[PDB]
C-alpha cells in the first residue's frame, strides 16, 4: 500500500526531506524559477532563492501493518478511542480487541485503513482519501514575491 | 421526582518483564581429583594409535 504525496516545501523544509530521504545528485526548481541542486547529497549550487518560494516534491509513504504510522487513531471492540503516535499496528498489545484504525492527515480528518480485522485496499483508501475532507476551503493568498533580479 | 443516570468504561493496559540470572559455583574435593588424568589420557590414545610400542 504505497501512496504519492505531491506537496510544495519551503527552503528549509524541501532541504530537511531531502536529508532525510537521501539524494545522491539532484536539481529542484521552484514556483518562481530558482533551483537548488543537491550533489552528492550536500548542497553544491543555489540560484536566488527569495522567502516563500515553493519547490514541488512527490514522497511515497507507504502503509503497512509492520512499519510504524506516525499519528492513527483506534477503536476498542468494547468502544473505547485510543490515539497512538509513531508505533507500528501490530505494535499494539491487543490487536485482538481492535476494531478499526484511522490514520491521522493532520487536517484533524481519518482515513480508514484498517477494518473488519484487514487492512484497506489501494482504490479503496484513495476513496476515502478522497471523501474524508470534501468541504475543506483553503485560505486564497497570493504574493509574487519576487521580480525579474537582473537588471535587463 | 428526581432521576438520574451514570456510565463508566474503563480499560487498563499492563505490561510485565523479569529477567533472573544466576549462578551456583559449588566446590567439591571429588572434581578436584578427576582433574588429574583429564590432560593425560588426550596422549595415551596418540601413544597407542601411532607410535612404535618395540624398542
Not at chain 1, 501512496?3 to 530537511?16: C, P, S
Not at chain 1, 492513527?72 to 478511542?81: A, P, S, T, V
Request: aromatic content about 14%; charged content about 25%.
Amino acid at each position: 500500500l504505497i501512496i504519492k504525496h505531491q506537496m510544495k516545501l519551503h527552503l528549509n523544509e524541501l532541504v530537511d526531506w531531502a536529508w532525510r530521504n537521501g539524494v545522491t545528485s539532484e536539481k529542484f526548481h521552484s514556483n518562481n524559477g530558482s533551483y537548488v541542486i543537491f550533489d552528492h547529497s550536500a548542497v553544491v549550487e543555489t540560484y536566488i532563492i527569495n522567502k516563500n518560494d515553493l519547490f514541488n516534491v512527490t514522497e511515497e509513504i507507504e502503509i503497512t501493518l509492520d512499519k510504524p504510522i506516525d499519528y492513527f487513531l483506534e477503536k476498542d471492540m468494547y468502544g473505547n478511542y485510543r490515539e497512538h503516535f509513531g508505533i507500528a499496528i501490530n505494535d499494539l498489545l491487543f490487536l485482538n480487541t481492535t476494531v478499526n484504525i484511522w490514520l491521522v492527515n493532520d487536517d484533524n480528518s481519518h482515513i480508514l485503513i484498517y477494518k473488519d480485522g484487514k487492512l484497506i485496499d489501494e482504490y479503496m483508501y484513495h476513496q476515502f482519501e478522497y471523501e474524508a475532507n470534501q468541504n475543506k476551503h483553503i485560505y486564497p493568498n497570493n504574493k509574487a514575491s519576487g521580480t525579474y533580479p537582473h537588471k535587463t | 421526582l428526581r432521576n438520574g443516570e451514570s456510565d463508566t468504561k474503563r480499560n487498563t493496559q499492563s505490561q510485565n518483564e523479569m529477567n533472573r540470572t544466576g549462578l551456583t559455583k559449588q566446590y567439591l574435593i571429588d572434581n578436584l581429583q578427576k582433574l588429574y588424568s583429564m590432560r593425560d589420557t588426550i596422549f595415551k590414545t596418540y601413544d597407542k594409535e601411532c607410535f612404535l610400542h618395540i624398542w
